[PDB]
Short mmCIF file of C-alpha atoms and ligand atoms in Angstrom, two decimals:
data_model
loop_
_atom_site.label_atom_id
_atom_site.label_comp_id
_atom_site.label_asym_id
_atom_site.label_seq_id
_atom_site.Cartn_x
_atom_site.Cartn_y
_atom_site.Cartn_z
CA UNK A 1 9.77 -36.83 -37.47
CA UNK A 2 11.38 -34.34 -35.11
CA UNK A 3 10.76 -30.76 -34.11
CA UNK A 4 13.96 -28.72 -34.23
CA UNK A 5 14.19 -26.17 -31.43
CA UNK A 6 16.79 -23.40 -31.47
CA UNK A 7 17.34 -21.14 -28.44
CA UNK A 8 19.27 -17.96 -29.18
CA UNK A 9 19.90 -15.89 -26.03
CA UNK A 10 20.96 -12.32 -26.81
CA UNK A 11 23.34 -10.63 -24.34
CA UNK A 12 24.14 -6.93 -24.56
CA UNK A 13 24.89 -3.80 -22.54
CA UNK A 14 25.62 -0.30 -23.90
CA UNK A 15 28.89 1.31 -22.86
CA UNK A 16 28.38 2.68 -19.32
CA UNK A 17 31.98 3.91 -19.09
CA UNK A 18 32.08 7.71 -19.15
CA UNK A 19 34.94 8.63 -21.51
CA UNK A 20 36.42 11.58 -19.63
CA UNK A 21 36.51 10.06 -16.11
CA UNK A 22 36.56 6.38 -17.12
CA UNK A 23 33.83 5.71 -14.53
CA UNK A 24 31.08 3.14 -15.10
CA UNK A 25 28.08 5.30 -14.25
CA UNK A 26 25.57 2.42 -13.87
CA UNK A 27 26.33 -1.07 -12.52
CA UNK A 28 24.16 -3.01 -14.96
CA UNK A 29 27.03 -4.76 -16.74
CA UNK A 30 28.43 -5.87 -13.37
CA UNK A 31 25.12 -7.19 -12.08
CA UNK A 32 24.12 -8.99 -15.28
CA UNK A 33 27.60 -10.50 -15.53
CA UNK A 34 27.44 -11.94 -12.03
CA UNK A 35 23.81 -13.00 -12.42
CA UNK A 36 23.29 -14.01 -16.08
CA UNK A 37 26.23 -13.82 -18.48
CA UNK A 38 28.13 -16.75 -16.92
CA UNK A 39 25.11 -18.61 -15.54
CA UNK A 40 23.03 -18.82 -18.73
CA UNK A 41 25.67 -20.83 -20.70
CA UNK A 42 26.56 -22.62 -17.45
CA UNK A 43 23.20 -24.45 -17.62
CA UNK A 44 24.92 -26.48 -20.37
CA UNK A 45 27.12 -28.06 -17.68
CA UNK A 46 24.01 -29.71 -16.19
CA UNK A 47 21.57 -30.24 -19.10
CA UNK A 48 22.31 -32.21 -22.26
CA UNK A 49 20.75 -29.77 -24.71
CA UNK A 50 22.02 -27.16 -27.18
CA UNK A 51 21.73 -23.44 -26.36
CA UNK A 52 23.07 -20.56 -28.48
CA UNK A 53 24.26 -17.12 -27.41
CA UNK A 54 24.81 -13.68 -28.91
CA UNK A 55 27.43 -11.45 -27.29
CA UNK A 56 27.75 -7.90 -28.49
CA UNK A 57 31.33 -6.59 -28.83
CA UNK A 58 30.65 -3.62 -26.55
CA UNK A 59 29.45 -6.07 -23.87
CA UNK A 60 32.57 -8.20 -24.33
CA UNK A 61 34.73 -5.08 -23.90
CA UNK A 62 33.12 -4.29 -20.55
CA UNK A 63 33.25 -7.89 -19.29
CA UNK A 64 37.00 -7.84 -20.02
CA UNK A 65 37.49 -4.55 -18.15
CA UNK A 66 35.74 -5.92 -15.06
CA UNK A 67 37.62 -9.23 -15.24
CA UNK A 68 40.95 -7.38 -15.44
CA UNK A 69 40.05 -5.31 -12.38
CA UNK A 70 40.10 -2.09 -14.43
CA UNK A 71 36.40 -1.12 -14.26
CA UNK A 72 35.82 1.88 -11.98
CA UNK A 73 32.14 1.27 -11.11
CA UNK A 74 30.63 4.05 -9.00
CA UNK A 75 27.64 2.10 -7.60
CA UNK A 76 29.84 -0.91 -6.83
CA UNK A 77 32.18 1.32 -4.80
CA UNK A 78 29.21 2.37 -2.71
CA UNK A 79 28.56 -1.32 -2.01
CA UNK A 80 32.19 -2.28 -1.33
CA UNK A 81 33.09 0.47 1.17
CA UNK A 82 32.75 0.10 4.90
CA UNK A 83 29.59 2.15 5.65
CA UNK A 84 31.65 4.47 7.90
CA UNK A 85 33.51 5.47 4.71
CA UNK A 86 30.39 6.19 2.65
CA UNK A 87 29.77 9.63 1.22
CA UNK A 88 26.31 11.08 1.80
CA UNK A 89 25.87 10.87 -1.98
CA UNK A 90 26.74 7.16 -1.95
CA UNK A 91 24.23 6.42 0.81
CA UNK A 92 21.69 8.21 -1.39
CA UNK A 93 22.66 6.11 -4.42
CA UNK A 94 22.36 2.87 -2.44
CA UNK A 95 18.88 3.76 -1.21
CA UNK A 96 17.58 4.89 -4.58
CA UNK A 97 18.97 1.79 -6.34
CA UNK A 98 17.15 -0.37 -3.77
CA UNK A 99 13.94 1.61 -4.21
CA UNK A 100 14.03 1.17 -7.98
CA UNK A 101 14.51 -2.62 -7.69
CA UNK A 102 12.48 -3.17 -4.50
CA UNK A 103 9.48 -4.84 -6.15
CA UNK A 104 11.40 -7.43 -8.15
CA UNK A 105 11.18 -11.01 -6.83
CA UNK A 106 14.97 -11.23 -6.61
CA UNK A 107 14.81 -8.48 -3.96
CA UNK A 108 12.39 -10.53 -1.81
CA UNK A 109 14.29 -10.33 1.48
CA UNK A 110 12.49 -9.48 4.73
CA UNK A 111 15.49 -7.41 5.77
CA UNK A 112 15.13 -5.15 2.72
CA UNK A 113 11.53 -4.36 3.68
CA UNK A 114 12.78 -3.64 7.19
CA UNK A 115 15.57 -1.32 6.08
CA UNK A 116 13.48 0.64 3.58
CA UNK A 117 10.90 1.42 6.29
CA UNK A 118 13.55 2.85 8.66
CA UNK A 119 13.83 6.61 9.08
CA UNK A 120 17.60 6.31 9.53
CA UNK A 121 20.20 3.58 8.97
CA UNK A 122 23.17 2.86 11.22
CA UNK A 123 26.39 1.14 10.11
CA UNK A 124 25.13 -2.43 10.55
CA UNK A 125 21.89 -1.60 8.73
CA UNK A 126 23.84 -0.06 5.83
CA UNK A 127 26.08 -3.13 5.72
CA UNK A 128 22.97 -5.25 5.24
CA UNK A 129 21.66 -2.89 2.57
CA UNK A 130 24.97 -3.14 0.69
CA UNK A 131 25.27 -6.91 1.01
CA UNK A 132 21.63 -7.64 0.17
CA UNK A 133 21.86 -5.52 -2.99
CA UNK A 134 24.84 -7.69 -3.93
CA UNK A 135 23.07 -10.95 -3.07
CA UNK A 136 19.85 -9.98 -4.85
CA UNK A 137 21.79 -10.35 -8.12
CA UNK A 138 23.36 -13.70 -7.22
CA UNK A 139 23.45 -16.14 -10.12
CA UNK A 140 22.50 -19.79 -10.18
CA UNK A 141 26.03 -21.14 -9.57
CA UNK A 142 26.69 -19.03 -6.50
CA UNK A 143 23.13 -19.37 -5.17
CA UNK A 144 24.17 -22.92 -4.39
CA UNK A 145 27.73 -22.17 -3.27
CA UNK A 146 26.64 -19.24 -1.05
CA UNK A 147 23.27 -20.66 0.08
CA UNK A 148 24.15 -20.29 3.77
CA UNK A 149 24.93 -16.58 3.47
CA UNK A 150 21.80 -16.08 1.37
CA UNK A 151 19.66 -17.76 4.04
CA UNK A 152 21.17 -15.49 6.71
CA UNK A 153 19.22 -12.65 5.12
CA UNK A 154 20.59 -10.09 7.61
CA UNK A 155 23.41 -9.23 10.02
CA UNK A 156 26.18 -9.25 7.42
CA UNK A 157 29.75 -8.31 8.21
CA UNK A 158 32.23 -6.50 5.99
CA UNK A 159 34.22 -9.75 5.67
CA UNK A 160 31.19 -11.62 4.39
CA UNK A 161 30.39 -8.86 1.88
CA UNK A 162 34.00 -8.95 0.68
CA UNK A 163 33.80 -12.73 0.34
CA UNK A 164 30.70 -12.42 -1.87
CA UNK A 165 32.43 -9.73 -3.96
CA UNK A 166 35.48 -11.92 -4.51
CA UNK A 167 33.29 -14.84 -5.62
CA UNK A 168 31.37 -12.52 -7.96
CA UNK A 169 34.61 -11.41 -9.64
CA UNK A 170 35.69 -15.05 -9.97
CA UNK A 171 32.46 -15.62 -11.96
CA UNK A 172 33.23 -12.63 -14.20
CA UNK A 173 36.79 -13.84 -14.76
CA UNK A 174 35.46 -17.22 -15.95
CA UNK A 175 32.79 -15.80 -18.25
CA UNK A 176 34.54 -15.60 -21.62
CA UNK A 177 36.13 -19.00 -20.92
CA UNK A 178 32.74 -20.67 -20.60
CA UNK A 179 31.59 -19.24 -23.95
CA UNK A 180 34.75 -20.64 -25.56
CA UNK A 181 34.21 -24.02 -23.89
CA UNK A 182 30.58 -24.53 -24.87
CA UNK A 183 31.45 -23.41 -28.40
CA UNK A 184 34.43 -25.74 -28.72
CA UNK A 185 32.46 -28.65 -27.19
CA UNK A 186 29.60 -28.19 -29.67
CA UNK A 187 27.06 -27.43 -26.96
CA UNK A 188 26.11 -24.12 -28.56
CA UNK A 189 27.06 -21.61 -31.19
CA UNK A 190 28.13 -18.07 -30.32
CA UNK A 191 27.19 -15.12 -32.53
CA UNK A 192 27.85 -11.39 -32.30
CA UNK A 193 26.20 -8.15 -33.46
CA UNK A 194 27.52 -5.00 -35.18
CA UNK A 195 29.75 -3.43 -32.63
CA UNK A 196 27.68 -0.96 -30.58
CA UNK A 197 24.25 -2.49 -31.29
CA UNK A 198 23.05 0.19 -33.81
CA UNK A 199 19.97 0.14 -36.06
CA UNK A 200 21.79 -0.84 -39.25
CA UNK A 201 18.77 -0.22 -41.57
CA UNK A 202 18.49 3.41 -40.44
CA UNK A 203 22.25 3.99 -40.75
CA UNK A 204 22.11 2.71 -44.35
CA UNK A 205 18.89 4.43 -45.33
CA UNK A 206 16.88 6.49 -42.82
CA UNK A 207 13.92 6.55 -45.24
CA UNK A 208 13.37 2.81 -44.65
CA UNK A 209 11.16 3.87 -41.71
CA UNK A 210 8.52 4.81 -44.30
CA UNK A 211 8.18 1.20 -45.44
CA UNK A 212 5.91 0.53 -42.42
CA UNK A 213 5.07 3.89 -40.77
CA UNK A 214 4.33 6.51 -43.44
CA UNK A 215 3.15 9.14 -40.96
CA UNK A 216 6.29 9.38 -38.84
CA UNK A 217 8.37 12.57 -38.73
CA UNK A 218 12.16 12.16 -38.84
CA UNK A 219 14.92 14.79 -38.84
CA UNK A 220 17.01 15.95 -41.80
CA UNK A 221 19.70 13.28 -42.24
CA UNK A 222 22.23 15.75 -43.68
CA UNK A 223 25.15 13.28 -43.26
CA UNK A 224 25.75 9.72 -44.43
CA UNK A 225 26.01 6.93 -41.84
CA UNK A 226 26.52 4.24 -44.52
CA UNK A 227 30.26 3.82 -43.93
CA UNK A 228 29.70 3.65 -40.17
CA UNK A 229 27.21 0.80 -40.67
CA UNK A 230 30.00 -1.10 -42.43
CA UNK A 231 32.42 -0.23 -39.61
CA UNK A 232 30.08 -1.60 -36.93
CA UNK A 233 29.99 -4.93 -38.77
CA UNK A 234 33.70 -5.12 -39.58
CA UNK A 235 34.85 -4.15 -36.08
CA UNK A 236 32.48 -6.74 -34.60
CA UNK A 237 34.04 -9.42 -36.80
CA UNK A 238 37.47 -8.36 -35.54
CA UNK A 239 36.44 -8.42 -31.86
CA UNK A 240 34.89 -11.88 -32.20
CA UNK A 241 38.06 -13.02 -34.01
CA UNK A 242 40.18 -11.79 -31.07
CA UNK A 243 38.12 -13.76 -28.53
CA UNK A 244 37.30 -17.00 -30.38
CA UNK A 245 40.05 -17.24 -33.03
CA UNK A 246 37.65 -17.29 -36.01
CA UNK A 247 35.51 -14.79 -37.81
CA UNK A 248 31.79 -15.01 -37.00
CA UNK A 249 29.48 -16.82 -39.39
CA UNK A 250 26.23 -15.80 -37.64
CA UNK A 251 25.06 -12.44 -36.37
CA UNK A 252 22.06 -11.25 -34.43
CA UNK A 253 20.89 -7.99 -36.02
CA UNK A 254 20.16 -5.53 -33.20
CA UNK A 255 16.44 -5.31 -32.40
CA UNK A 256 15.95 -8.05 -35.02
CA UNK A 257 16.28 -5.17 -37.49
CA UNK A 258 16.63 -5.96 -41.20
CA UNK A 259 16.04 -4.30 -44.55
CA UNK A 260 17.02 -5.18 -48.09
CA UNK A 261 20.08 -2.95 -47.79
CA UNK A 262 21.04 -4.34 -44.38
CA UNK A 263 20.81 -7.94 -45.59
CA UNK A 264 23.04 -7.05 -48.53
CA UNK A 265 25.56 -5.52 -46.12
CA UNK A 266 25.64 -8.62 -43.91
CA UNK A 267 26.14 -10.74 -47.05
CA UNK A 268 28.93 -8.51 -48.30
CA UNK A 269 30.71 -8.80 -44.94
CA UNK A 270 30.61 -12.61 -45.10
CA UNK A 271 27.80 -13.37 -42.64
CA UNK A 272 26.10 -16.66 -43.54
CA UNK A 273 23.01 -16.58 -41.34
CA UNK A 274 20.97 -14.24 -39.18
CA UNK A 275 17.57 -14.29 -37.56
CA UNK A 276 14.86 -11.65 -37.38
CA UNK A 277 11.25 -11.35 -36.27
CA UNK A 278 8.04 -13.07 -37.34
CA UNK A 279 6.26 -9.72 -37.84
CA UNK A 280 8.82 -8.85 -40.54
CA UNK A 281 7.97 -12.11 -42.28
CA UNK A 282 4.24 -11.35 -42.19
CA UNK A 283 4.90 -7.86 -43.55
CA UNK A 284 7.11 -9.17 -46.36
CA UNK A 285 5.38 -12.32 -47.70
CA UNK A 286 1.63 -12.88 -48.10
CA UNK A 287 1.67 -16.50 -46.86
CA UNK A 288 4.73 -17.79 -45.07
CA UNK A 289 5.52 -20.14 -42.25
CA UNK A 290 8.19 -19.26 -39.68
CA UNK A 291 9.28 -22.94 -39.47
CA UNK A 292 11.37 -22.91 -42.67
CA UNK A 293 14.93 -21.88 -43.41
CA UNK A 294 14.75 -18.83 -45.70
CA UNK A 295 17.34 -17.78 -48.29
CA UNK A 296 17.31 -14.05 -48.99
CA UNK A 297 18.14 -13.78 -52.73
CA UNK A 298 20.25 -16.98 -52.32
CA UNK A 299 22.82 -14.71 -50.58
CA UNK A 300 22.24 -15.21 -46.85
CA UNK A 301 20.19 -17.57 -44.69
CA UNK A 302 17.45 -16.07 -42.50
CA UNK A 303 15.31 -17.63 -39.81
CA UNK A 304 12.27 -15.85 -38.41
CA UNK A 305 11.79 -16.38 -34.70
CA UNK A 306 8.59 -17.76 -33.24
CA UNK A 307 7.32 -14.54 -31.66
CA UNK A 308 4.70 -16.20 -29.44
CA UNK A 309 7.13 -18.66 -27.83
CA UNK A 310 9.83 -16.00 -27.47
CA UNK A 311 7.38 -13.55 -25.86
CA UNK A 312 5.98 -16.22 -23.55
CA UNK A 313 9.40 -16.60 -21.93
CA UNK A 314 10.37 -12.94 -22.13
CA UNK A 315 7.06 -11.44 -20.95
CA UNK A 316 4.52 -14.00 -19.75
CA UNK A 317 5.88 -16.89 -17.71
CA UNK A 318 7.28 -14.78 -14.85
CA UNK A 319 3.60 -14.53 -13.84
CA UNK A 320 3.04 -18.32 -13.93
CA UNK A 321 3.83 -21.25 -11.72
CA UNK A 322 6.96 -22.87 -13.17
CA UNK A 323 5.57 -26.34 -13.96
CA UNK A 324 2.47 -24.88 -15.60
CA UNK A 325 4.63 -22.60 -17.76
CA UNK A 326 6.77 -25.55 -18.89
CA UNK A 327 3.65 -27.62 -19.56
CA UNK A 328 2.25 -24.75 -21.65
CA UNK A 329 5.50 -24.33 -23.63
CA UNK A 330 5.91 -28.04 -24.39
CA UNK A 331 2.22 -28.34 -25.27
CA UNK A 332 2.61 -25.55 -27.80
CA UNK A 333 5.63 -27.37 -29.26
CA UNK A 334 3.48 -30.51 -29.46
CA UNK A 335 0.86 -28.63 -31.50
CA UNK A 336 3.56 -27.35 -33.89
CA UNK A 337 5.01 -30.86 -34.20
CA UNK A 338 1.62 -32.39 -34.98
CA UNK A 339 0.55 -29.60 -37.35
CA UNK A 340 3.06 -30.09 -40.19
CA UNK A 341 4.27 -32.98 -42.36
CA UNK A 342 7.89 -31.83 -42.42
CA UNK A 343 10.33 -31.18 -39.59
CA UNK A 344 9.79 -27.58 -38.45
CA UNK A 345 12.60 -25.32 -37.22
CA UNK A 346 11.43 -23.26 -34.24
CA UNK A 347 13.62 -20.29 -33.29
CA UNK A 348 13.18 -18.92 -29.77
CA UNK A 349 15.14 -15.65 -29.68
CA UNK A 350 15.08 -13.04 -26.92
CA UNK A 351 17.36 -11.25 -24.51
CA UNK A 352 19.04 -13.72 -22.18
CA UNK A 353 19.55 -11.53 -19.14
CA UNK A 354 16.61 -9.17 -18.52
CA UNK A 355 13.54 -11.31 -17.81
CA UNK A 356 14.76 -13.54 -14.96
CA UNK A 357 14.80 -10.83 -12.28
CA UNK A 358 10.98 -10.83 -12.53
CA UNK A 359 10.65 -14.61 -12.10
CA UNK A 360 10.55 -16.32 -8.72
CA UNK A 361 14.06 -17.34 -7.65
CA UNK A 362 15.67 -15.63 -10.67
CA UNK A 363 14.00 -17.99 -13.18
CA UNK A 364 15.98 -20.99 -11.91
CA UNK A 365 12.95 -23.23 -11.18
CA UNK A 366 11.54 -22.36 -14.61
CA UNK A 367 14.71 -22.97 -16.61
CA UNK A 368 15.74 -26.09 -14.67
CA UNK A 369 12.26 -27.53 -15.25
CA UNK A 370 12.23 -26.48 -18.92
CA UNK A 371 15.67 -27.83 -19.78
CA UNK A 372 15.16 -31.04 -17.76
CA UNK A 373 11.90 -31.64 -19.63
CA UNK A 374 13.35 -30.79 -23.05
CA UNK A 375 16.25 -33.20 -22.77
CA UNK A 376 13.80 -36.05 -22.14
CA UNK A 377 11.41 -35.39 -25.05
CA UNK A 378 12.57 -37.75 -27.80
CA UNK A 379 10.71 -35.89 -30.54
CA UNK A 380 12.41 -32.51 -29.85
CA UNK A 381 15.99 -32.00 -30.99
CA UNK A 382 17.61 -28.77 -29.83
CA UNK A 383 20.17 -27.45 -32.32
CA UNK A 384 23.21 -25.21 -32.38
CA UNK A 385 23.06 -22.33 -34.88
CA UNK A 386 25.54 -24.29 -36.99
CA UNK A 387 23.22 -27.31 -37.08
CA UNK A 388 20.18 -25.15 -37.91
CA UNK A 389 22.12 -23.42 -40.70
CA UNK A 390 23.26 -26.67 -42.34
CA UNK A 391 20.44 -29.10 -41.46
CA UNK A 392 19.40 -31.00 -44.59
CA UNK A 393 16.00 -32.46 -43.62
CA UNK A 394 14.11 -29.16 -43.28
CA UNK A 395 11.95 -27.07 -45.60
CA UNK A 396 13.42 -24.02 -47.33
CA UNK A 397 12.10 -21.04 -49.25
CA UNK A 398 13.71 -18.24 -51.24
CA UNK A 399 12.56 -14.69 -50.58
CA UNK A 400 13.40 -11.62 -52.65
CA UNK A 401 12.47 -8.64 -50.48
CA UNK A 402 11.66 -7.69 -46.90
CA UNK A 403 9.84 -4.71 -45.46
CA UNK A 404 12.30 -2.96 -43.16
CA UNK A 405 11.51 -3.14 -39.46
CA UNK A 406 12.40 -4.44 -36.01
CA UNK A 407 10.88 -6.85 -33.51
CA UNK A 408 9.00 -3.85 -32.07
CA UNK A 409 5.76 -4.25 -34.08
CA UNK A 410 7.79 -4.55 -37.32
CA UNK A 411 8.72 -0.85 -37.22
CA UNK A 412 11.18 1.72 -35.87
CA UNK A 413 8.93 3.82 -33.61
CA UNK A 414 10.72 2.84 -30.40
CA UNK A 415 13.80 4.79 -31.54
CA UNK A 416 12.67 7.55 -33.91
CA UNK A 417 9.57 9.58 -34.63
CA UNK A 418 8.62 11.52 -31.54
CA UNK A 419 9.95 14.98 -30.77
CA UNK A 420 12.36 13.87 -28.06
CA UNK A 421 13.87 10.86 -29.85
CA UNK A 422 14.30 13.00 -32.98
CA UNK A 423 16.23 15.58 -30.96
CA UNK A 424 18.79 12.89 -30.15
CA UNK A 425 19.11 11.96 -33.81
CA UNK A 426 19.63 15.64 -34.60
CA UNK A 427 22.42 15.77 -31.99
CA UNK A 428 24.01 12.67 -33.55
CA UNK A 429 23.65 14.01 -37.09
CA UNK A 430 25.31 17.31 -36.20
CA UNK A 431 28.06 15.54 -34.25
CA UNK A 432 28.73 13.19 -37.17
CA UNK A 433 29.55 16.20 -39.41
CA UNK A 434 32.49 16.94 -37.09
CA UNK A 435 33.40 13.46 -35.79
CA UNK A 436 37.07 12.52 -35.54
CA UNK A 437 37.15 9.15 -33.75
CA UNK A 438 35.12 6.00 -33.15
CA UNK A 439 33.21 7.44 -30.20
CA UNK A 440 30.69 8.45 -32.87
CA UNK A 441 30.07 4.70 -33.31
CA UNK A 442 29.40 4.34 -29.58
CA UNK A 443 26.77 7.10 -29.87
CA UNK A 444 25.03 5.24 -32.72
CA UNK A 445 23.89 2.45 -30.40
CA UNK A 446 20.17 1.87 -30.17
CA UNK A 447 20.35 2.10 -26.35
CA UNK A 448 20.48 5.89 -26.48
CA UNK A 449 17.16 6.21 -28.34
CA UNK A 450 14.58 3.86 -26.76
CA UNK A 451 13.80 5.57 -23.47
CA UNK A 452 12.83 9.02 -24.66
CA UNK A 453 9.11 8.88 -23.90
CA UNK A 454 9.12 5.74 -21.79
CA UNK A 455 7.79 7.35 -18.72
CA UNK A 456 8.80 4.79 -16.12
CA UNK A 457 12.54 4.48 -17.21
CA UNK A 458 15.05 4.44 -14.40
CA UNK A 459 18.24 6.52 -14.58
CA UNK A 460 17.42 8.23 -17.91
CA UNK A 461 19.52 11.18 -16.77
CA UNK A 462 22.53 8.83 -16.74
CA UNK A 463 21.80 7.54 -20.25
CA UNK A 464 21.52 11.16 -21.39
CA UNK A 465 24.86 12.01 -19.76
CA UNK A 466 26.54 9.02 -21.42
CA UNK A 467 25.16 9.72 -24.89
CA UNK A 468 26.08 13.39 -24.77
CA UNK A 469 29.56 12.61 -23.38
CA UNK A 470 30.24 10.13 -26.20
CA UNK A 471 29.02 12.69 -28.76
CA UNK A 472 31.34 15.36 -27.38
CA UNK A 473 34.29 12.97 -27.12
CA UNK A 474 33.75 11.92 -30.75
CA UNK A 475 34.56 15.46 -31.90
CA UNK A 476 37.91 15.82 -30.15
O1 LIG B 501 19.92 0.29 -22.53
C1 LIG B 501 20.07 -0.36 -21.27
C2 LIG B 501 19.71 -1.82 -21.46
O2 LIG B 501 20.56 -2.31 -22.48
C3 LIG B 501 20.25 -3.63 -22.87
O3 LIG B 501 18.88 -3.79 -23.22
C4 LIG B 501 18.65 -3.71 -24.62
C5 LIG B 501 18.52 -5.13 -25.18
O4 LIG B 501 19.79 -5.80 -25.16
C6 LIG B 501 17.99 -5.09 -26.60
O5 LIG B 501 17.79 -6.41 -27.12
C7 LIG B 501 16.67 -4.33 -26.59
O6 LIG B 501 15.77 -4.94 -25.65
C8 LIG B 501 14.38 -4.90 -25.98
C9 LIG B 501 13.78 -5.95 -25.06
O7 LIG B 501 14.21 -7.25 -25.47
C10 LIG B 501 12.26 -5.90 -25.04
O8 LIG B 501 11.77 -6.81 -24.05
C11 LIG B 501 11.80 -4.50 -24.69
O9 LIG B 501 12.28 -4.15 -23.39
C12 LIG B 501 11.32 -3.48 -22.57
C13 LIG B 501 11.10 -4.31 -21.32
O10 LIG B 501 10.52 -5.58 -21.65
C14 LIG B 501 10.19 -3.58 -20.34
O11 LIG B 501 10.06 -4.36 -19.17
C15 LIG B 501 10.79 -2.23 -20.02
O12 LIG B 501 12.09 -2.44 -19.45
C16 LIG B 501 12.28 -1.84 -18.16
C17 LIG B 501 12.99 -2.89 -17.33
O13 LIG B 501 12.07 -3.95 -17.06
C18 LIG B 501 13.55 -2.30 -16.04
O14 LIG B 501 14.25 -3.30 -15.30
C19 LIG B 501 14.48 -1.15 -16.38
O15 LIG B 501 15.48 -1.62 -17.31
C20 LIG B 501 16.82 -1.31 -16.92
C21 LIG B 501 17.54 -2.65 -16.83
O16 LIG B 501 17.13 -3.29 -15.62
C22 LIG B 501 19.04 -2.51 -16.84
O17 LIG B 501 19.63 -3.81 -16.89
C23 LIG B 501 19.45 -1.68 -18.05
O18 LIG B 501 18.91 -2.29 -19.22
C24 LIG B 501 19.89 -2.65 -20.19
C25 LIG B 501 19.66 -4.12 -20.50
O19 LIG B 501 19.99 -4.92 -19.36
C26 LIG B 501 20.50 -4.55 -21.68
O20 LIG B 501 20.17 -5.88 -22.06
O21 LIG B 501 18.88 -0.39 -17.88
C27 LIG B 501 17.46 -0.40 -17.96
C28 LIG B 501 16.98 1.03 -17.76
O22 LIG B 501 17.49 1.51 -16.51
O23 LIG B 501 13.65 -0.17 -16.98
C29 LIG B 501 13.13 -0.57 -18.25
C30 LIG B 501 12.33 0.60 -18.81
O24 LIG B 501 11.22 0.85 -17.95
O25 LIG B 501 10.88 -1.52 -21.24
C31 LIG B 501 11.82 -2.10 -22.14
C32 LIG B 501 12.00 -1.16 -23.32
O26 LIG B 501 10.72 -0.96 -23.91
O27 LIG B 501 12.28 -3.64 -25.71
C33 LIG B 501 13.71 -3.54 -25.76
C34 LIG B 501 13.99 -2.54 -26.88
O28 LIG B 501 13.50 -3.07 -28.10
O29 LIG B 501 16.98 -3.00 -26.21
C35 LIG B 501 17.37 -2.91 -24.85
C36 LIG B 501 17.55 -1.43 -24.51
O30 LIG B 501 18.39 -0.81 -25.49
#
């Protein structure tokens, strides 16, 4: 009797490319590509397990632009330039980026503490600031290849910085190839999401928010977004087809968000399986175990992720010693394995790129320990999404209805319902009345709605500029 374990790492970035200037206004796609988007599947070169990945189409677009050398990234230019060539504004951007990342373990360089305590930085000090910002985001592969430059920790030259930059772009250029390879070799399945990561249930029926939060205020949805919901799905199928040669059979619904209407739409567009959140299951069925394969109306297969295990990795274990965290995770799997008569299916689903910057050494001790341990536990079998979808010796259940929601507490309050988030929806609704091109789809991404109210969110002025620029461009 085995326990079936399914990792599904979700990779996504909103479009940071300003449509009028073509400039990438934030470097987050660059830094997560060099740190995470190649290196997370690249663990499969060293560990004999299965790991699955979701890539959103808008992320794939940006990875391609960087790999082709076409991305004009404003923060990266401030890093690349000889400090003598820096604008005052670029020096300011470098310093503020450092300040906003200073406390993360991946920024744990003595030289950074030195530089940030200096009243004034000369050329050699700025060169170190530039190069250490680059190296702070170094991924697992290049942390070994560039270990000597990392251990320097200071006194970098322009040549050395340029060497690191070239190696970083090599990693980006190999990134889509590694997803194809692990897919073709059967080491993992690759899924995608509706194109710009929107909240499909709201686009189909904004009143679905009242299924869980009756007291929320929402704006007057005076236009229909139902066709756009279809377009997000169809365009995502086409993008995946371009990259991998086949249409996608699995999708990750953004924010784990489902509803009866959304599940019907995924079915109608030919999607065979998705996953969503355990809280949705609890809200939808009086007594239900998350370790079964569910069939929604016999139309589409649904797995509900194990929220505790997913949250332990995403939120908890950065604060633990790495062996203890792995011991805790395996011990929880042991309890699941011993608690049921059948073979349970355990979905661990979370973002694959955002938690590691808070772990010691970029989560590498944790993941190397975890994967090394997993491959040696005879009673755990890790599965691709394909294997989980088709596995015969598991328990199944049919369900007829779900209560619409997301993995945020089973509801939509992270993106709608306060005065400021609703203002953005009003802007989008009014722009949709006059939209003439697919930039209105870009503006429907969930990324433009989560930060309104999150005191503590860095660069919200840039997100506001991007959203409003996409909305204006959509009407031309
Ligand atoms: O929009 C920019 C953002 O885009 C993508 O993130 C998506 C993500 O792909 C979606 O799945 C979803 O994420 C969930 C998270 O899974 C969930 O954990 C939670 O996220 C909260 C964090 O846990 C919490 O720590 C805090 O986030 C901080 C974050 O720690 C800071 O580092 C900083 O985030 C910046 C990122 O560093 C930067 O890479 C980029 O983020 C991308 C992200 O990489 C990409 O995957 O920009 C952000 C902002 O500058 O600040 C934040 C805020 O203080 O709070 C978050 C949100 O509550 O919930 C989200 C939403 O359900 O959605 C995100 C965002 O759309």
